[PDB]
Amino acid sequence: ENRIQIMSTIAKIYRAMSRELNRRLGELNLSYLDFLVLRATSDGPKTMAYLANRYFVTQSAITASVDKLEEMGLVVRVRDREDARKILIEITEKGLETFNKGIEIYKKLANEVTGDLSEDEVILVLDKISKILKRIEEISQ
Amino acid sequence: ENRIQIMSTIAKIYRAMSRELNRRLGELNLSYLDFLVLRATSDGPKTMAYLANRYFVTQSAITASVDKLEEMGLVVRVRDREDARKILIEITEKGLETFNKGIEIYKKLANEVTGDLSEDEVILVLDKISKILKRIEEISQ
Ligand SMILES: [Ca+2]
Ligand SMILES: [Ca+2]
């Protein structure tokens, strides 16, 4: 039926986008996950637990991504003033710079794949799928 | 901007759906990937290379899924009459039965998350995102 197709098409779009993003982001020395980590911390420090849960990826995958971004000087680990085991991943200036370059790449690709759509259509679709997301997130967790 | 949000919302929807599907499919003794393997072979035998490429997953992940489904008696390996290394993964009757049960679960979830939408809206959104998919697939590969 149609409702099945909306969800399955969403999935196919995600897989194709994730693959192309991985390729285009490679030139900034980042994978799609590394970019997601930068996007998440671009607006504030994030715990590694949050990162793994928000983007549905193993904790070991987050550890690998953060270790990498840290070596690249794009994020830093900030330990609580009194506690030490409590860690927050904060983005750096260089990281924000790289993130912004990542956003342009994402924006460029988003403009292409949605080219057959007009502003009205884009807004119409966005409004409607935002409802779908609200529902699945209320269900999923 | 809006075009960015369409793609990012698509991704968030995918992650939330994949997580809930994994949970609901667990009762049929399948993960989301195993279900994808059954969906792919439900209409005809598929090579393992195709499976890994179509659903963007490592070959080792496909091997693990197929080994599993085979032990569960849901798929079989069919070797060419003359060649032996050439393998096709064919679904079994039990596999089709299990697949169909999987489809009902997917259908049930799809109906819920898209509840705020009407038939017209569903068709309208489907038509439009199918264009997005056509474009990304032409770009991605
Ligand atoms: Ca809930
Ligand atoms: Ca091409």
List chain B domain ranges. Answer: 1-141
Instruction: Tell me: is residue A141 an annotated ligand-binding position.
Output: yes
Residue B46: strand pairing partners: B89
Beta bridge partners of B89: B46, B77
Residue with tokens 């393998």: B87
Task: Please give the distance, rounded to the nearest whole angstrom, from the Cα atom of residue A25 to the centre of ligand 2.
Answer: 18
Q: In 10 A of CB B27, how many CB atoms?
A: 9
Interface contact A121-B137, CB threshold 8 A = no
CA-closest candidate to residue B57, choices B85, B27, B34: B34
The topology under which CATH files domain B1-141 is: Arc Repressor Mutant, subunit A (1.10.10)
CA distance linking residue A30 with residue A22, whole number of Å: 8
Kindly list the residues from chain B whose CB atom is less than 8 angstroms away from the CB atom of residue A129: 6, 9-10, 13, 125, 129
**B contacts of A130 (beta carbons < 8 Å):** 9
| Interstrand relation of A87-91 and B75-79 (parallel, antiparallel or unpaired) | unpaired
Burial level of A25, CB count in 10 A (0-12/13-18/19+)? buried
Cα B70 from Cα B48, distance rounded (Å): 13
Method used experimentally: X-ray
Residues in chain A closer than 8 A to B106 (CB atoms):
4, 7
Both tokens of A112, joined, read: 């292409």
What's the token pair of residue A58? 């193993």
A9 to B133: CB separation less than 8 angstroms, yes or no: yes
What ranges in chain A are assigned the alpha helix state H?
Answer: 2-25, 32-41, 48-54, 59-71, 93-113, 119-140
Contact B133, B127 (CB under 8 A): no
Q: What is the dihedral of CA B30, B36, B42, B46, to 10 degrees?
A: -120
Select the residue from A1, A5, A133 to test the B interface by mutation, using most B Cβ atoms within 10 A: A133
B141 is in an annotated binding site: yes
Return the SS3 of A78. Answer: strand
